[PDB]
């Protein structure tokens, strides 16, 4: 079909989010996407679909090192299209919107607050 020309040129939403979360975790469990990505052991927190099904935001847990975070970010944006193709080819969803990898840092507040409460002084009846 002239491929050279082509290349040259809500309750339902919650179920879809859960299904896509499981599918993306399953995809990341193996080197199916790439060996480099498999090495980094990316872990996902949640998957959120926009109300118009225009984009899929996958929230991946960040680490403490910054260079590792940057490398993970780069490989994830380079591999998102391959994940979309794999998801659509496996017939997990007949049409998947573009996948966007967003960093998750919500646990940082809890971690810092735990660290400070460990060393804080509550006095009598702690």
């Amino acid at each position: 079909k002239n491929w050279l020309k082509k290349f040259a040129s809500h309750a339902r939403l919650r179920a879809l989010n859960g299904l896509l979360y499981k599918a993306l975790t399953d995809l990341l469990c193996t080197p199916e996407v790439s060996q480099e990505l498999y090495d980094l052991n990316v872990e996902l927190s949640k998957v959120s679909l926009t109300p118009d099904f225009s984009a899929c935001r996958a929230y991946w847990k960040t680490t403490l090192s910054a260079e590792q975070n940057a490398h993970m970010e780069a490989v994830l944006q380079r591999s998102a299209a391959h994940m979309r193709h794999l998801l659509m080819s496996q017939q997990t969803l007949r049409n998947v919107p573009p996948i966007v990898f967003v960093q998750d840092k919500g646990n940082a507040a809890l971690a810092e607050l735990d660290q400070l409460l460990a060393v804080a002084d509550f006095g009598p009846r702690d």
């Binding site: 179920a15 975790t25 399953d26 469990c29 017939q91 969803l93 007949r94």
Partner: protein
């Protein structure tokens, strides 16, 4: 001597021994990692069931069966029940691509058994039965 990734063969003699036994005499831990459940059965080389543990047998219920923690607990239970029968070294035979594929092996190792080889036996038909239709979610 260079380490061989390939398993030993029963015919050709080899110097690899584990606690004095040969490769084909080590017990086998069969892991079935389904999508909602994981089942571990330890058997002897002569196919004597020694221990059995699945995520449903360790109290996990419904969707909690198909998680890594549940498979780890099942692996630990099977490892304990097999350690009580004289098993130390095991050959792991995994079947399926469920969430508990690797958590069961974590549990088995954390229960004290030593894994000497990993084998995959996931059923791959050469186009036999027809699969079901894709879900229209």
């Amino acid at each position: 001597t260079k380490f061989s990734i390939y398993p030993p063969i029963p015919g050709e003699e080899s110097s690899l021994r584990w606690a004095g036994k040969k490769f084909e005499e080590i017990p086998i831990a069969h892991i079935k990692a389904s999508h909602n459940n994981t089942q571990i059965q330890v058997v002897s080389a002569s196919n004597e069931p020694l221990a059995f543990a699945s995520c449903g047998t360790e109290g996990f219920r419904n969707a909690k069966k198909g998680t890594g923690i549940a498979a780890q607990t099942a692996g630990i239970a099977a490892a304990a029940r097999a350690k009580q029968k004289g098993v130390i070294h095991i050959r792991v035979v995994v079947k399926g691509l469920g969430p508990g594929r690797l958590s069961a092996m974590h549990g088995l190792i954390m229960g004290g058994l030593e894994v000497i080889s990993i084998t995959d036996n996931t059923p791959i038909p050469h186009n036999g039965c027809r699969p079901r239709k894709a879900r229209k979610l």
